[PDB]
């Protein structure tokens, strides 16, 4: 086994996302556009996987731009931090996108 | 202009659902099976529409059987009454299923 | 209550009907094929409920293609315009299909 | 922190790799075609990042089909096991693709 392999892969994927490198899709929330790779977005979110199987619009009231950005960062880094976004918005956005690990953790801390 | 036409249609669809008539799909939550029409579930929510486009297995932890039963009753009757359930579970299930009008109503009353 | 919910659902169903999405039956009138959902046709009238208890052929003399198109549009829109059809044709088609609200309106305006 | 998140993501990536879903490239080794995600091959290798800056032709004289299959399985599983190939074949293929963790493991065991 190669511990650390996946972390390096995700670090490179985060670089690519930040610089738009090899990104094959764009998600639009409100007036913000987020770059993403279909293979990761679909692998993490069942809903996105169903949608893919180039621009995807999300409801701007259910999923806010700040909660979305935080969820994407978590998606590629395993670290979820907010700022300009609260717990209720990240919880509902995670539910909307079927990010079950996030939904379970948020439910745990909210209760 | 034929007011009430949609009410009679939904009443008949609900009858069919209760008796398992003309039902082309089943949703399984935990160990409980809910019969449903593919076109109604797809019309009610973007997620079901995308998934359909016979048996669908839902995560029983995120969407409980009671919340699902309440949401399907609402979908076929327009009224969402609770029982063996509460606001937090009906809201989380509505979010999971993209029942945006339910999510908005629940956020309104929860806050 | 959720006013506008049913109108949005029917608008989406009409979209599907026009594009042939998630349609489980075809009605043939004369030399034209009209795609439709079994659950909606059955809900609108007991004639189809009995018939459905893939393709249904209607008599071309009793129900003309224009009257059928007008009524099928009504079924998903609540608006029934004669278009190229005569009132006698929409009357007879409505009677054959037991669309009693249409039959009543036609009788009202036969003079 | 969400332990196990990356493992589930890679499990889904490997599933779709085997089924060829949502994949944007094919690597050809000898006369065998291996479907892959450009974002993952590039993330794991500087060489692929340069190459992608649809179909990639590898030199069958150095990168054999067996070594390639083993290395792609490693990339999508974290566990590298020999198949029909021997250690030298895997080392040479890892070197060609700059999969440094494999090159180091191979040198360790060869020494």
Identify any residues that bridge with B32 across adjacent strands, giving them in sequence order. B29
> Of B50, B62, B96, which has the smallest distance from its Cβ to A51's Cβ?
B50
Dist CA B26 CA B48 (whole Å): 12
CB A62 within 8 A of CB B94: no
Selecting from A6, A22, A49 the residue whose C-beta is nearest the C-beta of D6 gives: A6
In whole angstroms, what separates CA D62 from the centre of its chain? 14
Token pair listed for C91 = 């009357």
Q: Copy the structure tokens of residue D43.
A: 């993330």
- Chain mean position to CA C51: 15
Please enumerate, as own/partner, the contacts of B34-37 that have beta carbons within 8 Å and a separation of 24 or more: B34/B68, B34/B69, B34/B72, B36/B72, B37/B13, B37/C39
C25: tokens are: 């039956």
Instruction: Give, as one character, the DSSP assignment of residue A62.
Output: T
Experimental technique of record: cryo-EM
Distances (CA, A) of C84 to B79, C64, C90: 40, 11, 10
Give the separation between CA C98 and CA D78, rounded to whole angstroms. 65
Beta pairing class for A55-57 and A25-29: parallel
Placement of tokens 């918005």 in the chain: A89
Is there a contact between D75 and D41 (Cβ–Cβ < 8 Å)?
A: yes
Question: What is the phi/psi pair of residue C33, to 5°?
Answer: -110, 120
CB count within 10 Å of CB D88 equals: 11
Residue C22 belongs to domain with CATH number? 3.30.710.10
Q: How far apart are CA C68 and CA C63, in angstroms?
A: 6
Q: Which residue of D has its CA nearest to A104?
A: D2
A92 in Cβ contact with B103 (< 8 Å): yes
* Cβ contact A39:D5 at 8 Å: no
Cβ within 8 Å, pair A78-D6: yes
Query: What is the rounded distance in angstroms from the CA atom of residue B94 to the CA atom of residue B53?
Result: 20
Spell out which chain A residues touch chain D, with contact meaning CB-CB distance below 8 angstroms.
Answer: 1-2, 5-7, 9-10, 12-13, 16, 22, 24, 37-40, 42-44, 49, 52-53, 74, 78-80, 101-102, 105
In 3D space, the residue among A100, A65, A62, A110 whose CA is nearest the CA of residue B102 turns out to be A62
Residues B97/B63, Cβ–Cβ less than 8 Å: yes
- Work out the burial of residue D110: count CB atoms within 10 Å of its CB; fewer than 13 is exposed, 13-18 middle, 19 or more buried: exposed
- The residue segments making up the domain with residue C50 are 5-108
Residue B4, CA distances (Å) to A27, C15, D30 in order: 40, 22, 68
CB contact under 8 A, D43 and A12: yes
Number of structural domains chain A divides into: 1
Contact between A109 and A79 (Cβ < 8 Å): no
Q: Which residues of A touch B98 (CB under 8 A)?
A: 62, 96
Q: Which residues on B lie below 8 Å from A58 (Cβ)?
A: none
CA dihedral C91, C92, C98, C99 (to 10 degrees): -30
**Is residue D44 a contact partner of residue D24, using CB atoms and an 8 Å limit?**
no
């Amino acid at each position: 086994d190669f511990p650390g392999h996946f972390e390096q892969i995700f670090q490179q994927l985060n670089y690519q996302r930040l610089h738009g490198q090899l990104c094959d899709c764009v998600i639009v929330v409100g007036n913000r556009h987020f770059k993403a790779h279909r293979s990761v977005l679909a692998a993490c979110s069942t809903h996105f996987r169903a949608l893919f199987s180039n621009m995807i619009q999300l409801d701007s009231e259910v999923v806010t731009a700040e909660a979305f950005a935080a969820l994407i960062d978590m998606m590629y880094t395993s670290t979820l931090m907010l700022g300009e976004s609260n717990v209720m918005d990240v919880l509902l956005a995670a539910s909307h996108l079927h990010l079950n690990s996030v939904v379970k953790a948020c439910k745990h801390y909210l209760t």
